[PDB]
Amino acid sequence: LNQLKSVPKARNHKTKTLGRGHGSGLGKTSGRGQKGQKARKSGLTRPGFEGGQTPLYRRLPKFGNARKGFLKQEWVVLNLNKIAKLKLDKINRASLIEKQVISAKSQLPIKLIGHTKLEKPLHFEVHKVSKQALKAVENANGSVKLLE
Amino acid sequence: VVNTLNTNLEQSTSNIKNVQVKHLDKVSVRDLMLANALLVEKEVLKALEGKF
Amino acid sequence: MKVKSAAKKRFKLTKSGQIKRKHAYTSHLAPHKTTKQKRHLRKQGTVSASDFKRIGNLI
Amino acid sequence: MRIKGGKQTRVRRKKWLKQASGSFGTRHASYKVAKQTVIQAAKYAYRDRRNKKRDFRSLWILRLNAALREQGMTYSVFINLLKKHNIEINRKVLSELAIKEPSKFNLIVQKVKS
RNA sequence: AAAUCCAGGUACGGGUGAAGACACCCGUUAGGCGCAACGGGACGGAAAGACCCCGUGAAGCUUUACUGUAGCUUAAUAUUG
RNA sequence: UUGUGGUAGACGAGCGUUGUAUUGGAGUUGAAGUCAAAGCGUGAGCAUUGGUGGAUCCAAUACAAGUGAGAAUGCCGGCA
RNA sequence: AGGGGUGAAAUUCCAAUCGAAAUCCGUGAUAGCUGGUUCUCGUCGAAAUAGCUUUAAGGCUAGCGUGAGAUCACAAAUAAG
RNA sequence: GUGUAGUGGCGAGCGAAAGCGGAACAGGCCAAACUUAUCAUUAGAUAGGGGUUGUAGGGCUUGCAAUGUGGACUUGAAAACGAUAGAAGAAGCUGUUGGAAAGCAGCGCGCAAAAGGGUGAUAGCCCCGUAUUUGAAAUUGUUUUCAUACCUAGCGAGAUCCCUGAGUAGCUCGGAAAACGUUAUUUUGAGUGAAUCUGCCCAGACCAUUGGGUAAGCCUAAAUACUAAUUAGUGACCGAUAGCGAAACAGUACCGUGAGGGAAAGGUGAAAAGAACCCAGAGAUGGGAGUGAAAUAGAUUCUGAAACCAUAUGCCUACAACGUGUCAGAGCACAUUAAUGUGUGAUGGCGUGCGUUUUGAAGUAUGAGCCGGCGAGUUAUGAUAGCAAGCGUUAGUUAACCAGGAGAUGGGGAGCUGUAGCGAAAGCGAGUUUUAAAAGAGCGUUUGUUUGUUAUUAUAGACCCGAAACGGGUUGAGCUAGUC
Ligand SMILES: [Mg+2]
Ligand SMILES: [Mg+2]
Ligand SMILES: [Mg+2]
């Protein structure tokens, strides 16, 4: 690129120098306004604040948490709207790791889902399937095996 | 650019400020486009093709 | 930033913005509010555009 | 890196000082007063660039009325005899300068008497 | 030496003006520069008003303001039969 | 063709500084710093010659900022 | 010998300073309160209002500015009815 | 993991433990039974052997198999690589400008040595060095080898036998550490106080089942934190108001009784070749002379700006109401970055500074005496939005760490964002929540990630400077007050 002269396409934006004269704008006040609280150093009061008035978040009641102190048991999900693009049969753990859909260092239950039609038959052994997802995958003359 | 990093050549060319010998994996974009002249050696063509 | 602890317990963040919230005026006094008010305030709504920016950057 | 910047300040204040010469007292010595004097002088120049074309017109009017009063008519009557009839687009700077070379402006004052 | 000082070549009357003008508008007077005086003015100098008010300022003090506490006092308990 | 006053402020386009990296170049036949002059640009600014001074400096493209000074009863130094 | 001392008691004295010494440290204490904040040109360009606020010299939202984008016609202004 | 679970006048805020990916890797030793010896053997004590624990182990009886591997380990001997001084260490002349050549030009040469410094101006070949090769009488470091102590050694059968850390664990009342603001867990001031392998403790009250682990004894290198010190080196670090306060005889001068506070300041020349000698003057000194390329380099010692002070060429000024200029305008004197030139300005018209803060300032509001220098929107880590780039529809992308010249980069898929959302939640699923309702309503029925740059913002002092104060530690009764 002839280092004696190298150029980008477009990245050099106007830099707002705050204390550099009225000619450029941003004169003595540096864009802080005129003699307010913001104008003083360390202005811009606490993010959630409405000047003494009860702030919005403090007025509203709290959402409850029924299952308290627990983490929702995560699921790994195969949506049929995209699995067709993944050309593979006998979908299982021994294969999904090769396609890098899931990772080897993961012992997690596998769930099936989706309403879209699918053309070529497939085969799964998973833990849960939706009702109409099972109907759709069976209508394609596929199969599914329910692992506990 | 070189693969085996011969020592006869590396021992030479050391005092010559303009020249420099670098391994195939030691060269950078700046270290290459600054040369304006280089002598690639015979085999690294295949390795460069593989690495693309 | 540390998420404001008093914010995440009132604002379930829904898909594509539109922060959700419960309604107030539902915790203390029953008789002073009519059944119309009582069965409208039980449902939840979003936050208006005025406070949407100030709440979104707080979460 | 740390920057001192001695040349630029000296050059700038030298230019500002040089803009003002012949000024009384310390005005031509101290930059802090020289800049203010240059501002005021340029304001005065901007005002007088309009004032001078406002005033030379009046000067022409005066030196034309003075000549016209020696022929037996006033300046106000003159313009009508130019405008309404014997139409001319003769400016007031030459309708005033022509008196300085007379016997030709009297042709103007007599032509309008028709 | 000293405090002081935006640059000055620094008149008076009527009026105007951020509301009492050396500089403005209209008039009147006034050769340039000293020295000794005397203090009317330059809202003359020194002192970010000590009075008054504001600050969700400070300190000191007071009490049947609030919350505590040193101390004093009473009980249970170990030393204790 | 419509315009082109402007404080707070919003946006765009630029000048200058010191250093770094690439090319190019100048310099005891006198560089930089300094002064002078009746030079040139829309503006930040940029030249030309002469005196002094005696050893580094300039141009093009990017990058990096301890980068631009009239005011803070500012500090320091000098002189009224 | 200092949230201490001393006081024939005045808020006296404690190294020219005392309603609580001097010096160092936490310390670049905080300040909704003053003052300061430095190069250029071009385009556009307000508000001093409403509600709430231990709020009134402050703040949040709305109102008014500006940049990007959309709506061109059913939207918005201008006359007549 | 993550700003997650949680904790919080549920306010300000605070913030894990698992799990995963990495750096490093070593586990041993006592008490106790049992037994030997010695203690007025009342041992209830001392010194030996034995044993060091969870798929419970050890002791007790009776056997089998072993002579080893290993040390967080003793002595010497040997080897190796260093550390503390050094030695060798290539290559050039001529000409010109010049005071001086090393500049520049012409013709050559060396290179495992074109780092640096000096040499009268910028030297690969003038010198010291450099790359490279070598060098230890003496002290000392590290590792390896040999022998050498000390420690260290497996597997069976029997049998209600014994031992397994007591003012201990728990429990009560007060506190605290753990992310918790007293809560399972840990800790303790007062009190109280067990069990012994069918045991005891634990799996955020508590009980049962299941499972995990065996407290109330001790020690242990590596990854880790730091750099006043030594050696080498580096810098898009400072260059005499900067950089440590201190480039120099700096914690000095100076102030304070004392704790303590605490500055300023450099450069002749190439080498003194520091100005013999003459004049003036008492002398300092100045003018000559001399050295010197330069004496307007002369010790005041590189460069020398402005404020300020003087002197002079040209023009103007002593009837003049002046924010001092401006637009016109003679006269006068000159000749330039050749330009409808410059210098001055009798005279005419007009004309109440600069920044601040204000509804409104020439202001009888405020700040600056002038000049010069220093002096205020930064950085770390995040989030948001704009612009552009890379890769893209089972996408994108690394972190720590390792290797790489304190480089780009390669390895590292641990994670992160997106791919399906709704619901407080279990759950369901292109649906889901509410609901008797599949009605109705709310949310959804697809647009990405990693960067660079800009702007804004959050925690950090977070544009600059300015308090009276607050809390802790020290120095002060030499003045003054009281007392002896
Ligand atoms: Mg300013
Ligand atoms: Mg201000
Ligand atoms: Mg006064």
UniProtKB/Swiss-Prot annotation, chain A:
GO cellular component entries: cytosolic large ribosomal subunit
Chain intervals with Gly residues compositional bias: 20-34
Pfam families with a match to the protein in the record: Ribosomal_L27A
GO terms, biological process: translation
Gene3D superfamilies, per database record: 3.100.10.10
Function: Binds to the 23S rRNA.
Quaternary data: Part of the 50S ribosomal subunit.
UniProt family annotation: Belongs to the universal ribosomal protein uL15 family.
Protein's name in the database: Large ribosomal subunit protein uL15
Organism: Mycoplasma pneumoniae (strain ATCC 29342 / M129 / Subtype 1) (Mycoplasmoides pneumoniae)
Gene giving rise to this polypeptide: rplO
From Swiss-Prot, chain B:
Keywords: Antibiotic resistance, Ribonucleoprotein, Ribosomal protein, RNA-binding, rRNA-binding
GO MF, one example: structural constituent of ribosome
One Gene Ontology cellular component: ribonucleoprotein complex
Highest taxon of source: Bacteria
Any one GO biological process: translation
Signal peptide extent: none
Disulfide bridge map: none
Subunit structure comment from the entry: Part of the 50S ribosomal subunit.
Family that this chain belongs to: Belongs to the universal ribosomal protein uL4 family.
Function of the protein: One of the primary rRNA binding proteins, this protein initially binds near the 5'-end of the 23S rRNA. It is important during the early stages of 50S assembly. It makes multiple contacts with different domains of the 23S rRNA in the assembled 50S subunit and ribosome.
Protein name as it appears in the record: Large ribosomal subunit protein uL4
Source lineage: Bacteria, Bacillati, Mycoplasmatota, Mycoplasmoidales, Mycoplasmoidaceae
Annotated gene: rplD
Residues of the full protein shown: 160 to 211 of 212
UniProtKB/Swiss-Prot annotation, chain C:
GO molecular function (one): structural constituent of ribosome
GO cellular component terms given for this protein: cytosolic large ribosomal subunit
Keywords: Ribonucleoprotein, Ribosomal protein
Pfam families reported for this sequence: Ribosomal_L35p (PF01632)
Gene Ontology biological-process annotations: translation
Ranges of compositional bias, category Basic residues: 30-43
Segments for region (Disordered): 1-22, 30-49
Family membership: Belongs to the bacterial ribosomal protein bL35 family.
Name of the protein this chain belongs to: Large ribosomal subunit protein bL35
Organism of origin: Mycoplasma pneumoniae (strain ATCC 29342 / M129 / Subtype 1) (Mycoplasmoides pneumoniae)
Gene name linked to the record: rpmI
Curated annotation (Swiss-Prot), chain D:
Family designation: Belongs to the bacterial ribosomal protein bL20 family.
Domain of life: Bacteria
Cysteine pairings via disulfide bonds: none
Example of a GO MF term: structural constituent of ribosome
Protein name in UniProt: Large ribosomal subunit protein bL20
Alphabetized Pfam families for the sequence: Ribosomal_L20
Any one GO CC term of the record: ribosome
InterPro entries, sorted: Ribosomal_bL20, RIBOSOMAL_L20_CS, Ribosomal_protein_bL20_C
Gene Ontology BP term (one): translation
Cited Gene3D superfamilies: 6.10.160.10, Ribosomal protein L20
UniProt keywords, alphabetically: Ribonucleoprotein, Ribosomal protein, RNA-binding, rRNA-binding
KW Transcription regulation (keyword) present: no
